[PDB]
């Protein structure tokens, strides 16, 4: 029931992901180093990791079928509002139940359990879905092309692009994901997108607080300041 166009969409998103997610971390050596022992000793390293990852999320987004047909303005609004959520999603691939990060490390970048507890709970629940890589990359793409992001102009078009991806995901689940694993799986994936909105909001609140201090803002990168705010 998966059409030729749906198979094509999935192949494009798998490759896009492979081209932008290096599971060897060969690039992490170029970040400011993690420091472990208001210290914020992990802020330089994690700011560089996040800045790097925003670059990768952008590379992935550019390859989402249809994303190129949006105006540069709408592409901007969609990336700024989704970047932290796609970083959280894509990090599920390194999450497990110098470059392994624990709760203390995130604390040492200026964040609190108000963010970190729900974030770990999200990563556990996502891991339990045991998604196929096809599903994982469709979910990141659906997250990016969300018509309800504030500031979207041509929402109809964004919606149309997202529907094509949502329909692909739903058909993929029916055709390629065997029960019991597949039971309510689409609704569960959409619930994760809802969970990400709440995480986005709490991250934004803590980010505004930590970056309000110029000494911490100094430790971020130019891209992080531009995307997450300054």
């Amino acid at each position: 029931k998966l059409s030729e166009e749906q198979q094509h969409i999935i192949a494009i998103l798998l490759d896009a992901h492979h081209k932008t997610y290096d599971p060897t971390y060969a690039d992490f050596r170029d970040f400011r180093p993690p420091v472990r022992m208001s210290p914020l000793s992990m802020l330089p390293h994690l700011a560089d990791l996040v800045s790097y990852s925003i670059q990768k999320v952008i590379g992935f987004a550019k390859m989402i079928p249809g994303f190129r047909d949006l105006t540069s303005d709408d592409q901007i609004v969609l990336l700024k509002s989704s970047a932290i959520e796609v970083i959280m999603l894509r990090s599920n691939q390194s999450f497990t139940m110098d470059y392994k990060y624990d709760v203390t490390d995130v604390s040492k970048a200026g964040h609190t359990l108000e963010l970190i507890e729900p974030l770990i709970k999200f990563q556990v629940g996502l891991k339990k879905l045991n998604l196929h890589e096809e599903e994982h990359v469709l979910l990141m793409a659906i997250c990016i092309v969300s018509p309800d992001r504030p500031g979207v102009q041509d929402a109809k078009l964004v919606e149309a692009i997202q529907d094509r991806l949502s329909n692909t995901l739903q058909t993929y689940i029916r055709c390629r994901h065997p029960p019991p694993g597949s039971h309510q799986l689409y609704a569960k994936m959409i619930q994760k997108l809802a969970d990400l909105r709440s995480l986005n909001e709490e991250h934004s609140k803590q980010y505004r607080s930590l970056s309000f201090q110029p000494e911490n803002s100094m430790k971020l990168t130019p891209l992080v300041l531009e995307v997450f705010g300054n």
Binding site: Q55, I58, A61, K62, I76, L79, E226, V227
Partner: peptide, 11 residues
């Protein structure tokens, strides 16, 4: 605000 870096990466 402007987003010159994001604009440049989006090509």
């Amino acid at each position: 605000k402007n987003h010159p870096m994001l604009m440049n990466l989006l090509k």
